[PDB]
């Protein structure tokens, strides 16, 4: 079902037309900034990396990187810009909802804007996917637009496409963004180190004007709960 | 819009 809307927008048969707003041709600056700061270490995992811009970045590091996407489409362009660039980054499809396959593969998880379309308990699906693909004691980042930010990012892209509508008013469920939906997903398996005030970089179609709104970067911990782990206790504990 | 539903 939502494999179908994404395929379609980056097909270019939305009303984006040729850009997604996200889609912005180049590593968001927070990850590019996460990567500086040495917080991104072993087997990356890009988990809705789309058309493969940060795990590019990442890969022209020397960082072993995957990015997994719904979207066949994007991970075929994906698969493109890495034969173009001349780097080897693992572009695969797969549902970030079950990742069947992937147990305990990667140390870093990172995430721009895929954790932000889940709400309730298809965020914690999500999580509970992310600590089974995740070796023991692995950092996962995600990087969610705040309500603050989608409010700039909906007038803006409300101002430009004819049929997206404009925010509404007031403050005040489901469709909220605070720290706190971020906090209760990542619960069960996962110790929050530290949620930060960030950006997202998104890029307005009309003009192609680039702009940073406010989004949230999370980082979690991903506990050490694993056979490999509980064989190791055994071999010190008899 | 951008992308809570996902993502137009
Ligand atoms: N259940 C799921 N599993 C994996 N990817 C998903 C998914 N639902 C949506 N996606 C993907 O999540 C992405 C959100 S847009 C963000 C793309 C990329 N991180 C970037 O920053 O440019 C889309 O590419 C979409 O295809
Ligand atoms: C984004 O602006 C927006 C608004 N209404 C929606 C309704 C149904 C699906 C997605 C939507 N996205
Ligand atoms: C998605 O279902 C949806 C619906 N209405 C919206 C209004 C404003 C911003 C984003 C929205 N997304
Ligand atoms: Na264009
Ligand atoms: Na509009």
Redesign the interface.
Known sequence: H?TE??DA?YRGE???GKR???DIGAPQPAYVALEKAGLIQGAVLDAGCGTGEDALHLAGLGYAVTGLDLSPTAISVARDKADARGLGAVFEVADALDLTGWEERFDTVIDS?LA??F?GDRLRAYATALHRACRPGAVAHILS?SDRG?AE??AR??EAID???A?LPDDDPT?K?SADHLRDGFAEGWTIESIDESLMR?VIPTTSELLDVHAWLGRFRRDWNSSSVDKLAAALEH | XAXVXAXV
Do not use: N
């Open positions: 939502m809307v994404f927008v939305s009303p984006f997604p707003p996200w804007g932000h379309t709400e637009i989608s990012m909906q892209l409300a049929e997206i509508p925010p469709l963004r998104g």
